Amino acid sequence: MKIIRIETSRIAVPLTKPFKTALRTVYTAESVIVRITYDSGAVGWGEAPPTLVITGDSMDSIESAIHHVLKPALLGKSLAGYEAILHDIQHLLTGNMSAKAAVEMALYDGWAQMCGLPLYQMLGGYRDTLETDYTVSVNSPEEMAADAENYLKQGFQTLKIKVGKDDIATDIARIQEIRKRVGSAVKLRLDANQGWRPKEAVTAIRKMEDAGLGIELVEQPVHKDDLAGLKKVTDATDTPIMADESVFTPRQAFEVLQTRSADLINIKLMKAGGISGAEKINAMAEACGVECMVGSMIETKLGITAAAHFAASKRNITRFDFDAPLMLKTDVFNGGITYSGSTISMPGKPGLGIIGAAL
Amino acid sequence: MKIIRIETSRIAVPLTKPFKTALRTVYTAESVIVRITYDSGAVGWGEAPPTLVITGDSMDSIESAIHHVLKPALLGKSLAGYEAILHDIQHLLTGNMSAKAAVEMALYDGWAQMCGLPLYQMLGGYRDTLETDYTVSVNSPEEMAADAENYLKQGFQTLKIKVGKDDIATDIARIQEIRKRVGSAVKLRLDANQGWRPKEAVTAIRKMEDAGLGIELVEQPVHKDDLAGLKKVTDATDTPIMADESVFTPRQAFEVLQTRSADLINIKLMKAGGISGAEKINAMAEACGVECMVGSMIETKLGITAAAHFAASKRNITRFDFDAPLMLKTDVFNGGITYSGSTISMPGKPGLGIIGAAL
Amino acid sequence: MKIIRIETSRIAVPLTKPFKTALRTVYTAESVIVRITYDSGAVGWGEAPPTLVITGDSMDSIESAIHHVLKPALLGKSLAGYEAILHDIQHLLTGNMSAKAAVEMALYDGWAQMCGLPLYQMLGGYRDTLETDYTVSVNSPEEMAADAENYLKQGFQTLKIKVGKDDIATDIARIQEIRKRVGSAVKLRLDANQGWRPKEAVTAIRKMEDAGLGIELVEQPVHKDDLAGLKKVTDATDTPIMADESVFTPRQAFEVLQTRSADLINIKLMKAGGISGAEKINAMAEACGVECMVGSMIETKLGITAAAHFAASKRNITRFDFDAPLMLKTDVFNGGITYSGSTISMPGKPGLGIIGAA
Amino acid sequence: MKIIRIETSRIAVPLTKPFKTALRTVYTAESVIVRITYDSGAVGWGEAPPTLVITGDSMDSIESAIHHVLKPALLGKSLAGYEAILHDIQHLLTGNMSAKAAVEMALYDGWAQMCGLPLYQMLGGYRDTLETDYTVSVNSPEEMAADAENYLKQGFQTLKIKVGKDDIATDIARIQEIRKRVGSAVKLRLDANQGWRPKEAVTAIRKMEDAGLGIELVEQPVHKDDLAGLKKVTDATDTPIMADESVFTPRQAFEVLQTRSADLINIKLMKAGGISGAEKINAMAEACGVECMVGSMIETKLGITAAAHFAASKRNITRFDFDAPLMLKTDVFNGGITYSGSTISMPGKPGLGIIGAA
């Protein structure tokens, strides 16, 4: 199994719900698609979207990194020496985690195909189905509660709500209105996206507790670099605190675990620069009795399939956040995982199970 | 591929150098051999010797654990669901690490055969040859200097010396004599086997470097559960200090790395309960910039072959202590690794490469 | 036991003495190496070199056939029903005999491993050693005779000489110089590689008879499709005539045997699409009292090892042409058969005995 | 895997329905049972009944051949060298095909046990179940018709009928009455046992077509040595003609196939001297597009088990005639194949699968 060709292409898939950034309004989901062709004729697939605010990677930086650094280093190499290939991918350049992840996806796809197994089975095969949460778009508490009940009826028992942008009072009113229409029938996951200061986070999370909102967990309440602050929120509340942006790499996972700064860890391939890193983070957490969740960036079903195969393979990964593909007006890929309500099913073919560009 | 049969047997290979325990004189190397048969026709092999003083495992405890707990839980299981199998092996019972290790060997043997690759390649395939050290048996400094010369003439440039039993003056005199024969033509690794107190170890190690003995590293100078003491020795000497008995599991590795109590870690399958735990230890160590060594207990080529496959696959594993097989009068196994002087070569067929009993 | 992976790799081994074709100059011997891995831990090996002039297969056609046709039909299958697998391999596509043969090699290798026996014993194990001939490169009669004597001293009592390209007189001059030089006991095998017309062949073969050259046999004197002509040469000379290119498959073997168009049959795995067909050809011949020889195309020790295992197993196979690996500057495979002069020895490990790359 | 002991014993199983020969009344099915013991402890089984009219072999000729010729030649031989052993069995003495067959059964039984696989899988494993026809005894048209209907209700959709003994009008009247009872619910195989002259057979078969009897096939219509005659019948009828007594060995199979004298070939281990020859006949036939059937002589489940294993293993063997065991009042063997209506199923243990006496 030798790598003989590496190609990249760009895609732009219209969003069902456009959103605005500080500089513009996004109507499409862009990402770099990677195709690694092996001497066996097999094709490994990878995906990497830009996340200027989270990783700092852009379409241009991702493609350049793949064409100027990773590609010339991977050509001709064989998957028999995987340890060395992964080390080169992670160390030939600093950062550019997204570019590295896209390449790792295609490599693990090739690796699983080589062994004749679905990627998730190659990584441990713990489960073949998993439940994904669904995001309730921010809006008036009344509108969110409406969407929430309808998502509940569609089979989603876990909903995700972004908080930490508006007033704490606004966040709380929204969640209250939501429970008013669904009760405990659904679990509520919040992501503050580093929007609060430590003391401000403790206050808001306790308020929700006093209001008996029963929050399942709160992701990254404080600034990613503020570990001591993240730990303050963890030790001052009864609601589990999940580290997201604070943990990209296994070394950062080790720091968070060592200081006991969080109850849980949210893993994403883009942040870890791929599966190898993601695996190390989860294994590390597991040994410390800390469960993990696997999420993603705005990605098509390709990136979500790689993410899902990794998540499905580990016992210690007990939560999943893979609704990005459901936010696209179209599915441009043939194969991969399949959705039935909130239930994601793993494919049976070797590798990722991605056949090619849909039609 | 499903497990359909699990058998065990005992072997006794006469040692080339019998030694004495507190209760008797040992002439043979005893071990429990495990054979797992898969519905594909594949056979997985594993080994586990008793280590009453190191692990507390005996031939009977090992065999009983395999037949009454591990076996009934593994028969009928599919390797496509490895994660669940590993979890059961490690958690169905406490301790019994050697029994868990023996079963893990045969399990990974089959897993590699199911994916059709030499085990070390399945785990990363970083190198296909490695250099093992050789043990200079304790005796008068004169005889030790002689043996060291012969071993060196045989291709062994790295010698392991057991210290910490007699008084420091005696250890230094032994090491001095050896240097007086081979000079700086060899590297010297010491293993104090918890024989010193922290303050005492610091003094002994400093006296060695003040005598220009040039010790490569010192393994476990203090008691295994005296982490603070191990750390003291680590921060007081310029000689690298390697944790051995202080680290059995990945959780203990985490604690040692977290407190920076040692410069290196010596991994052994019997202590880690197999390869899955050994991988975790190495991965945590690597994330912390700590390299590892892989050693073993008194085992035949089978056990060593399993450990060598794990050791050869990882970049972070840079030292190897696999001379056990060279201490037996007869090699009872066919296949596995091969020795050319101090150079160990990895077999190429799928799995461990062990074909069965010697023909 | 299930097939979990089928892979191919290209190799190019520099020849000790290159040759020219109609389009270029060949400096290396290329081949497609096939590896079939089973979940039992066994790994089967196979080799298929290109032969654009003989079979029509190229490196690309061979590789494509295995990747797009044979591979998808075998992945996931088990060797419980060999009859069905072999049948499917031979009928999934027409021609592409080289691709089919390399896969059959790896399948038989795996099958013998499962049974725990060297492939040659699983097939019959008639002999443990066999004598291979050696080819005397075409040159001046003076130079060929020198090489011949040299091979004779090294232990080769049977030599093969290619004829039918140059003048008949030139062939005779070169052969007569050799026969007189090495002695009449030695056996000289000729391969006319379809270079003569029937009457032209009878004349030449008769001229060597009159010169008392003692030719052991003449391989395929006429065009492979000219069975009537091949038969004419067979019935007009005293020298035995061996069918080669005229016989690829057992059906063709049946045709040659029923018409008695040849005295012997040369079997090659590449031509028969593997060991199953080769085995049927030999069985047919034996039943007709016709002995066979096993040869090969330009292949490394892998392809030769498979050929030798098949050849060594049958009593009716009495001649061997396996010097191809000796024409390579280096041996790239570890294991397989071993050479000791002209003597080839079968290995003792299960299957083909191929360990891997050198 | 070495042969260390070879023993023989005689058995006599009472027939459910005795028959008369040109000299006496037969009430029991007799055969010689061969037991080959190997150094591993494994035991190989073989069987051979006398067929004074078909092969010429008798109980005494068989036992003597085994003890005085085959036994001293096989004692101490290893199955790793199967080819040599098979060559010895087939060539140490001429004829004596039944004795050769019995020994081969016990050898293939051990060979397969050595490889740890059911014999049928070791030979190709094409199918693991097969449909056997059933014999309708010759009697009045009305009685045969009653039997046909009966066997049908038991699951036997394919019936075999012996013809060519009586007048042509009688055979037809019998078959007509059978068609009247079951109609097209069954296939009818006829065996003329060399009872007609070529012209007479052509006439008889065309009359059966005209009568819309729908005959599946006719075995050996003419004398076994009359190949030209056999071919005439083949070419003058639309009904497929099967060679039986005309083909014992692979060489005779070659002659029949070469001349296109028959549409099909019936194989029996006793005629071919075992499985090696049977395998050659079938491979030969398959190459010519000629399908085969496998039947037997009057044998117990042991002999039929060996034949069934061979029949089940090949793709080209598409018809089966194994009702012999069903004609005995007792089954003296434990193991081997098992019946369920007309369906025969292959056992799962290594070799033939018979444990011993019942």
Ligand SMILES: [Mg+2]
């Ligand atoms: Mg988040």
Ligand SMILES: [Mg+2]
């Ligand atoms: Mg130690």
Ligand SMILES: [Mg+2]
């Ligand atoms: Mg030729």
Ligand SMILES: [Mg+2]
């Ligand atoms: Mg008949």
